[PDB]
Design a protein around this ligand. Structure first.
Ligand code: NAG
Ligand code: NAG
Ligand code: NAG
Ligand code: NAG
Ligand code: NAG
Ligand code: NAG
Ligand code: NAG
Lengths: 49, 118, 49, 20
């Protein structure tokens, strides 16, 4: 629900799509790379789980 | 080495919150670190969208997130509320609107247009 | 502290590949981490300057 | 609002010559 934030302080809610988008941005991959193919990413994560 | 002589991205390695620096202090048979950290406070809710649909193109934030105070949309840095007008300078474009889930219509102001008239 | 509560740039610390996020799972006498990581695939050559 | 400010001009690359 809040990602990295509750470790730093009070938990700040954020949509999970935007959280994973920044985490993509954290590894040098722009946000549009995730948003343009969010469904494939979700399917891959579900299949891996 | 990683906190007195530098700044650490490792979460909660040197004090809770975002690490700014640390100060060493001698102690008998040990050492004491005074981890200075940046702790956010006084948060408030906002409505957000992953991207903004200008005329047939989807704009994403270069740095920060889109938020709205109820009626007007602003782009602000992620961990401190400093709202700003949406412009082509602080956003970048990639693809058309319909591919992104949660896209929202809003105007993005080109700073060149009001500047150039002669 | 580093993989679950944040995102770590440390290579191969939170699983192989570029780290996105991790999920902890309790286990008897231990803990189990599910390291979600981004690994590139489907390469192709290019000339560069 | 900021301490340590120093006056100086900041050049605009959008209009040093490019007027039409
Ligand atoms: C955000 O909204 C929820 C539900 O309306 C509320 O419980 C919460 O306190 C709000 N957060 C802030 C910081 O006001
Ligand atoms: C949102 O901000 C704009 C610009 O600061 C202002 O004109 C408008 O009244 C604000 N609306 C609300 C609901 O705060
Ligand atoms: C968000 O959730 C509401 C209620 O479930 C739904 O009506 C809306 O379409 C959702 N929007 C997105 C972008 O997921
Ligand atoms: C406004 O957004 C809706 C979907 O939310 C879209 O169908 C419509 O085309 C947008 N407006 C314009 C002028 O494109
Ligand atoms: C790139 O070029 C090398 C040598 O020409 C070739 O072996 C390889 O299959 C090409 N493609 C990739 C993805 O490396
Ligand atoms: C530095 O200190 C001097 C007084 O010693 C003061 O006049 C000056 O404004 C200070 N400058 C800054 C940037 O703090
Ligand atoms: C130059 O700096 C001084 C002190 O910061 C300030 O009072 C003055 O207004 C500045 N010059 C101009 C033209 O604003």
């Amino acid at each position: 629900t809040s990602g990295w934030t509750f470790g730093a302080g009070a938990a700040l809610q954020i949509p999970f799509a935007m959280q994973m988008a920044y985490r993509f941005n954290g590894i040098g991959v722009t946000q549009n790379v995730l948003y343009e193919n969010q469904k494939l990413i979700a399917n891959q994560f579900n299949s891996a789980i | 080495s990683e906190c007195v002589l530098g700044q650490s991205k490792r979460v909660d390695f040197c004090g809770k919150g975002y690490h700014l620096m640390s100060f060493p202090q001698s102690a008998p048979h040990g050492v004491v670190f005074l981890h200075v950290t940046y702790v956010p406070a006084q948060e408030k809710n906002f409505t957000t969208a992953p991207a903004i649909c200008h005329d047939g193109k989807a704009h994403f934030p270069r740095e920060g997130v889109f938020v709205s105070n109820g009626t007007h949309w602003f782009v602000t840095q992620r961990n401190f509320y400093e709202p700003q007008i949406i412009t082509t300078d602080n956003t970048f474009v990639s693809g058309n609107c319909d591919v992104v889930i949660g896209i929202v219509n809003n105007t993005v102001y080109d700073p060149l247009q009001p500047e150039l008239d002669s």
